[PDB]
Design an enzyme around this catalytic site. Structure first.
Site, PDB file in Angstrom:
ATOM      1  N   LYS A  50    -114.010  31.476 -94.114  1.00  0.00           N
ATOM      2  CA  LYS A  50    -114.506  30.382 -94.709  1.00  0.00           C
ATOM      3  C   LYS A  50    -115.876  29.723 -94.037  1.00  0.00           C
ATOM      4  O   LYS A  50    -116.523  28.753 -94.675  1.00  0.00           O
ATOM      5  CB  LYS A  50    -113.346  29.177 -94.740  1.00  0.00           C
ATOM      6  CG  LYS A  50    -112.443  29.679 -95.353  1.00  0.00           C
ATOM      7  CD  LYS A  50    -111.270  28.744 -95.245  1.00  0.00           C
ATOM      8  CE  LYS A  50    -109.805  29.294 -95.770  1.00  0.00           C
ATOM      9  NZ  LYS A  50    -108.824  28.590 -95.547  1.00  0.00           N
ATOM     10  N   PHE A  91    -114.212  37.272 -82.292  1.00  0.00           N
ATOM     11  CA  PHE A  91    -113.890  37.663 -80.935  1.00  0.00           C
ATOM     12  C   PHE A  91    -112.145  37.520 -81.050  1.00  0.00           C
ATOM     13  O   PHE A  91    -111.398  38.293 -80.602  1.00  0.00           O
ATOM     14  CB  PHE A  91    -114.544  37.043 -79.864  1.00  0.00           C
ATOM     15  CG  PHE A  91    -113.818  37.087 -78.483  1.00  0.00           C
ATOM     16  CD1 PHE A  91    -113.384  38.402 -77.917  1.00  0.00           C
ATOM     17  CD2 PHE A  91    -113.590  35.739 -77.761  1.00  0.00           C
ATOM     18  CE1 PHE A  91    -112.894  38.172 -76.552  1.00  0.00           C
ATOM     19  CE2 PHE A  91    -113.123  35.890 -76.430  1.00  0.00           C
ATOM     20  CZ  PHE A  91    -112.697  37.246 -75.865  1.00  0.00           C
ATOM     21  N   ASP A  96    -106.523  38.832 -81.436  1.00  0.00           N
ATOM     22  CA  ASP A  96    -105.133  38.171 -81.667  1.00  0.00           C
ATOM     23  C   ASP A  96    -104.385  39.167 -82.760  1.00  0.00           C
ATOM     24  O   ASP A  96    -103.300  39.242 -82.677  1.00  0.00           O
ATOM     25  CB  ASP A  96    -105.467  36.810 -82.392  1.00  0.00           C
ATOM     26  CG  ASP A  96    -105.920  35.706 -81.366  1.00  0.00           C
ATOM     27  OD1 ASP A  96    -105.652  36.288 -80.272  1.00  0.00           O
ATOM     28  OD2 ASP A  96    -106.017  34.738 -81.666  1.00  0.00           O
ATOM     29  N   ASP A 100    -100.448  40.661 -81.963  1.00  0.00           N
ATOM     30  CA  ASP A 100     -99.295  40.308 -82.651  1.00  0.00           C
ATOM     31  C   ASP A 100     -98.925  41.527 -83.688  1.00  0.00           C
ATOM     32  O   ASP A 100     -98.271  41.171 -84.535  1.00  0.00           O
ATOM     33  CB  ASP A 100     -99.526  39.051 -83.503  1.00  0.00           C
ATOM     34  CG  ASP A 100    -100.663  38.792 -84.424  1.00  0.00           C
ATOM     35  OD1 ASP A 100    -100.747  39.551 -85.061  1.00  0.00           O
ATOM     36  OD2 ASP A 100    -101.250  37.883 -84.253  1.00  0.00           O
ATOM     37  N   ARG A 105    -105.828  40.789 -92.360  1.00  0.00           N
ATOM     38  CA  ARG A 105    -106.677  39.505 -91.921  1.00  0.00           C
ATOM     39  C   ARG A 105    -107.689  39.305 -93.094  1.00  0.00           C
ATOM     40  O   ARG A 105    -108.298  40.283 -93.784  1.00  0.00           O
ATOM     41  CB  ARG A 105    -107.519  40.000 -90.638  1.00  0.00           C
ATOM     42  CG  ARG A 105    -108.733  39.064 -90.257  1.00  0.00           C
ATOM     43  CD  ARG A 105    -108.284  37.624 -89.904  1.00  0.00           C
ATOM     44  NE  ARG A 105    -107.353  37.519 -88.865  1.00  0.00           N
ATOM     45  CZ  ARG A 105    -106.890  36.516 -88.527  1.00  0.00           C
ATOM     46  NH1 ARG A 105    -107.360  35.371 -88.979  1.00  0.00           N
ATOM     47  NH2 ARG A 105    -106.304  36.499 -87.179  1.00  0.00           N
ATOM     48  N   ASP A 167     -98.967  30.502 -75.802  1.00  0.00           N
ATOM     49  CA  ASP A 167     -98.236  31.025 -77.183  1.00  0.00           C
ATOM     50  C   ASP A 167     -97.346  32.180 -76.888  1.00  0.00           C
ATOM     51  O   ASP A 167     -96.356  32.296 -77.373  1.00  0.00           O
ATOM     52  CB  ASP A 167     -99.459  30.836 -78.163  1.00  0.00           C
ATOM     53  CG  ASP A 167     -98.840  31.167 -79.726  1.00  0.00           C
ATOM     54  OD1 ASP A 167     -97.863  30.601 -79.695  1.00  0.00           O
ATOM     55  OD2 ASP A 167     -99.587  31.791 -80.442  1.00  0.00           O
ATOM     56  N   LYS A 193    -105.036  26.150 -77.727  1.00  0.00           N
ATOM     57  CA  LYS A 193    -105.388  27.555 -78.782  1.00  0.00           C
ATOM     58  C   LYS A 193    -106.183  27.252 -79.754  1.00  0.00           C
ATOM     59  O   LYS A 193    -107.205  28.244 -80.277  1.00  0.00           O
ATOM     60  CB  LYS A 193    -104.110  28.220 -78.929  1.00  0.00           C
ATOM     61  CG  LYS A 193    -104.261  29.534 -79.706  1.00  0.00           C
ATOM     62  CD  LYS A 193    -103.138  30.319 -80.342  1.00  0.00           C
ATOM     63  CE  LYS A 193    -103.362  31.418 -80.925  1.00  0.00           C
ATOM     64  NZ  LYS A 193    -101.924  32.087 -81.539  1.00  0.00           N
ATOM     65  N   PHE A 232    -104.781  19.150 -88.004  1.00  0.00           N
ATOM     66  CA  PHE A 232    -105.124  20.320 -88.942  1.00  0.00           C
ATOM     67  C   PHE A 232    -103.956  21.426 -88.694  1.00  0.00           C
ATOM     68  O   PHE A 232    -103.601  21.973 -89.888  1.00  0.00           O
ATOM     69  CB  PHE A 232    -106.500  20.896 -88.353  1.00  0.00           C
ATOM     70  CG  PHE A 232    -106.806  22.097 -88.821  1.00  0.00           C
ATOM     71  CD1 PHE A 232    -107.105  22.545 -90.312  1.00  0.00           C
ATOM     72  CD2 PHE A 232    -106.657  23.368 -88.146  1.00  0.00           C
ATOM     73  CE1 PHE A 232    -107.288  23.946 -90.858  1.00  0.00           C
ATOM     74  CE2 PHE A 232    -106.787  24.553 -88.433  1.00  0.00           C
ATOM     75  CZ  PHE A 232    -106.798  24.979 -89.978  1.00  0.00           C
ATOM     76  N   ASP A 236    -101.538  22.676 -91.349  1.00  0.00           N
ATOM     77  CA  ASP A 236    -101.767  24.123 -91.597  1.00  0.00           C
ATOM     78  C   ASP A 236    -100.494  25.025 -91.499  1.00  0.00           C
ATOM     79  O   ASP A 236    -100.093  25.892 -92.458  1.00  0.00           O
ATOM     80  CB  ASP A 236    -102.685  25.047 -90.792  1.00  0.00           C
ATOM     81  CG  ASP A 236    -102.851  26.323 -91.024  1.00  0.00           C
ATOM     82  OD1 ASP A 236    -103.556  26.739 -91.907  1.00  0.00           O
ATOM     83  OD2 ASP A 236    -102.474  27.135 -90.074  1.00  0.00           O
ATOM     84  N   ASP A 237     -99.378  24.557 -90.398  1.00  0.00           N
ATOM     85  CA  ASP A 237     -98.269  25.037 -90.431  1.00  0.00           C
ATOM     86  C   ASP A 237     -97.369  24.735 -91.476  1.00  0.00           C
ATOM     87  O   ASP A 237     -96.557  25.588 -92.202  1.00  0.00           O
ATOM     88  CB  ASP A 237     -97.489  24.554 -89.240  1.00  0.00           C
ATOM     89  CG  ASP A 237     -97.992  24.858 -87.983  1.00  0.00           C
ATOM     90  OD1 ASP A 237     -98.906  26.104 -88.117  1.00  0.00           O
ATOM     91  OD2 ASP A 237     -97.937  24.690 -86.702  1.00  0.00           O
TER      92      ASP A 237
HETATM   93  O1  LIG Z   1    -111.577  27.231 -91.934  1.00  0.00           O
HETATM   94  C1  LIG Z   1    -110.354  26.822 -91.588  1.00  0.00           C
HETATM   95  O2  LIG Z   1    -109.796  27.961 -91.214  1.00  0.00           O
HETATM   96  C2  LIG Z   1    -109.736  25.558 -91.415  1.00  0.00           C
HETATM   97  C3  LIG Z   1    -110.839  24.429 -91.704  1.00  0.00           C
HETATM   98  C4  LIG Z   1    -111.007  23.633 -92.668  1.00  0.00           C
HETATM   99  C5  LIG Z   1    -110.449  23.749 -93.863  1.00  0.00           C
HETATM  100  O3  LIG Z   1    -109.462  24.631 -94.427  1.00  0.00           O
HETATM  101  O4  LIG Z   1    -110.843  22.949 -95.180  1.00  0.00           O
HETATM  102  N1  LIG Z   1    -111.916  22.955 -92.806  1.00  0.00           N
HETATM  103  C6  LIG Z   1    -112.296  22.954 -91.214  1.00  0.00           C
HETATM  104  C7  LIG Z   1    -113.315  22.169 -90.659  1.00  0.00           C
HETATM  105 CL1  LIG Z   1    -114.219  20.805 -91.477  1.00  0.00          CL
HETATM  106  C8  LIG Z   1    -113.584  22.443 -89.238  1.00  0.00           C
HETATM  107  C9  LIG Z   1    -112.774  23.455 -88.739  1.00  0.00           C
HETATM  108  C10 LIG Z   1    -112.040  23.970 -89.371  1.00  0.00           C
HETATM  109 CL2  LIG Z   1    -110.973  25.278 -88.483  1.00  0.00          CL
HETATM  110  C11 LIG Z   1    -111.678  23.926 -90.609  1.00  0.00           C
END
Ligand SMILES: O=C(O)Cc1c(C(=O)O)[nH]c2c(Cl)ccc(Cl)c12
Ligand SMILES: O=C(O)Cc1c(C(=O)O)[nH]c2c(Cl)ccc(Cl)c12
Ligand SMILES: O=C(O)Cc1c(C(=O)O)[nH]c2c(Cl)ccc(Cl)c12
Ligand SMILES: O=C(O)Cc1c(C(=O)O)[nH]c2c(Cl)ccc(Cl)c12
Lengths: 343, 343
Positions: A50, A91, A96, A100, A105, A167, A193, A232, A236-237
């Site tokens: 993303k 990386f 990772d 696991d 991915r 972890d 992490k 976050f 997420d969990d």
């Molecule tokens: O991109 C991602 O995996 C999670 C994620 C989202 C989001 O899901 O909106 N937004 C984020 C921002 Cl604004 C800063 C840092 C991260 Cl890690 C994220």
């Protein structure tokens, strides 16, 4: 939408990133086949996510640096450093997934699972890491914040690797031990992490490129960003299981993978001797029937409501944190991120 | 014996290296279990070799820096940077053993082969790498050659990883393809995978700590050291099979591991259609009978004499290189190394 719009300019820069990295192949045709493999590693692993971490660097840069100091060159460096964060992310993910034994991915087959790659992906992961420093040298060598960025990327890798160590020790593959799934361990894993490199690194990078190298300013930003990083991962969990795949775009596997999820930690604090037993005999299982049992127990303990209440308290706390530690930085830097993660 | 003697002071410093690295565990008891794992990784993997790369830093430092500028602190930094090279070496070996599925290292079981470690060794390897930069920051942060050393260690990792990429592409496990075992490929692999970090890095590090940051001085030293690095690996390859285990302290496995050895490259340039066939049906085999066949063919092609003649020409060339590019550095810096590798 600062992201949705600026996103196009970021992703399009990737082609230039690859070009520059696979350019030393010129005066050194000897490593030509190696550079070709590198290009393939970059294209397969740095693209497909993303780009939120990288985009944050750019967005924060624009809000922290006066428009008159945003020359074509300064913006060039912004996109690069942003892509460096994406290389760090690549990386980590390549390594990772190997550790696991993941199958896929970003919906695609894991790089190491590709025929002809395998454990060679270990060296591929290290190359992704090395490209970070190659780009910083190529674009920011003469900048006054050069050393700051090198140290930040190095520090962020160390923190993350330390978190990965915690972890691995906490959730040893092929050994479900709910005993170590404590809230303090969970918070430490998330902090090291995930939080540091996902939320602090991007903004801190932008801060240095803007001249904001003050230790106090960085300490205050970290205070805020680590708290947001913690929320976050918790959200997420929660979404991993209780989220809607049509909106999330992914299927949960935390239970099956015996992960130290916020849900299991909360379920272990409210579970009774009999409930704990069911969790102990169903967590880390792939059979849908066993997974469904876990999810059933979570609902019974009303974890979804617990999370709902947590998100509201977390948001209020973050606003207060921003209200207190944002200055002298523009609150928008943090509010922009908060609006994105708090769904 | 500058080495045999200075060696004691180097190895004894390790205990301090570990202490300093596992000290941040103080203000962060949260990562205590992680720091404990790190200590275990360091002790198992950074100890047990010959320390020649690290010792070179110290030896070169003393010869390059005037005795009056060799204060207790300057020497402290020397041992540290020397140990950083050993950490780089440990980062590489842990990862390389995994990638080629080795069973043992330094006579002991490979770290990843240890029960309870496995693929987690991938993260352990990255921690070893990260400790490099932690030590440099802790001991050389205020020094004027701080950035130079960071860039040198980063550049050396990149070169080495690139060489590893070439090597993996050249000798794919479970796929003997003598076709790609060319002399040009072999030389490129040696140059990038071994020469740079094993011979150039140590001296170059000492040069920077002595203030010798001139690009020309570094370019001249590299010219010499890479040639010595090339001879070292060629002699290493030759000794792998024709060396005396009682003197070498190890048993050859290059043939069995289908490695792109100097011997096989030379054997492929002198082999006839019939000989090539025997090599093609015996190289990369574990059966002693098949290995013996390969060794038999090498002798028939008189490779041992070819190497003997090569060592003499190589030595003369190195002396000429020293005679020409050593200045303004003391020739002893290079002569010391030459005396050690040319056996
Ligand atoms: O991109 C991602 O995996 C999670 C994620 C989202 C989001 O899901 O909106 N937004 C984020 C921002 Cl604004 C800063 C840092 C991260 Cl890690 C994220
Ligand atoms: O986690 C795993 O063991 C394998 C696995 C992966 C994956 O590895 O990508 N993805 C899964 C999904 Cl979407 C549903 C159920 C399972 Cl078992 C998996
Ligand atoms: O230590 C080794 O594995 C090989 C080796 C030997 C040596 O064997 O005498 N000597 C070395 C020197 Cl002086 C500088 C750099 C390296 Cl790698 C070596
Ligand atoms: O190279 C290998 O396949 C395994 C292997 C290792 C080792 O891995 O340490 N060591 C070996 C020795 Cl000393 C003699 C013969 C073989 Cl087959 C091996």
């Amino acid at each position: 939408d600062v992201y949705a719009q600026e996103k196009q300019d970021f992703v399009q820069h990737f082609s230039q990133i690859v070009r520059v990295l696979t350019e030393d192949e010129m005066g050194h045709p000897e490593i030509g086949d190696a550079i070709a493999r590198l290009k393939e590693v970059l294209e397969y692993n740095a693209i497909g996510g993303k780009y939120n971490r990288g985009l944050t660097v750019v967005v924060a840069f624009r809000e922290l640096v006066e428009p008159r100091k945003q020359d074509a060159d300064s913006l060039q460096r912004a996109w690069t450093v942003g892509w460096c964060v994406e290389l760090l992310q690549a990386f980590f993910l390549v390594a990772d997934d190997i550790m696991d034994s993941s199958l896929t991915r970003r919906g695609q087959i894991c790089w190491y699972q590709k025929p002809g790659v395998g454990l060679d992906a270990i060296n591929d992961a290290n190359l992704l890491e090395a490209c970070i420093y190659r780009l910083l040298k190529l674009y920011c060598r003469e900048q006054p914040y050069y050393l700051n960025l090198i140290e930040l990327f190095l520090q962020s890798s160390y923190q993350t690797e330390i978190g990965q160590t915690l972890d691995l020790l906490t959730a040893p593959q092929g050994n479900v031990d709910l005993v170590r799934f404590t809230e303090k361990r969970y918070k430490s894993i998330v902090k090291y992490k995930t939080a540091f490199y996902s939320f602090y690194l991007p903004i801190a990078a932008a801060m240095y490129m803007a001249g904001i190298d003050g230790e106090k300013e960085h300490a205050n930003a970290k205070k805020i960003l680590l708290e947001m990083g913690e929320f976050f991962q918790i959200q997420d969990d929660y979404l991993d299981l209780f989220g809607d795949p049509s909106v999330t775009g992914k299927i949960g596997t935390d239970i099956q993978d015996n992960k130290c999820s916020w849900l299991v930690v909360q379920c272990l604090q409210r579970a009774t001797p009999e409930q704990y037993q069911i969790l102990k005999e169903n967590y880390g299982q792939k059979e849908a029937e066993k997974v469904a049992r876990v999810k059933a127990l979570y609902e019974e303990l009303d974890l979804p409501a617990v999370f709902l209440q947590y998100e509201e308290d977390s948001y209020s706390h973050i606003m207060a944190l921003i209200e207190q530690y944002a200055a002298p930085l523009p609150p928008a830097v943090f509010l922009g991120l908060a609006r994105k993660i708090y769904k």
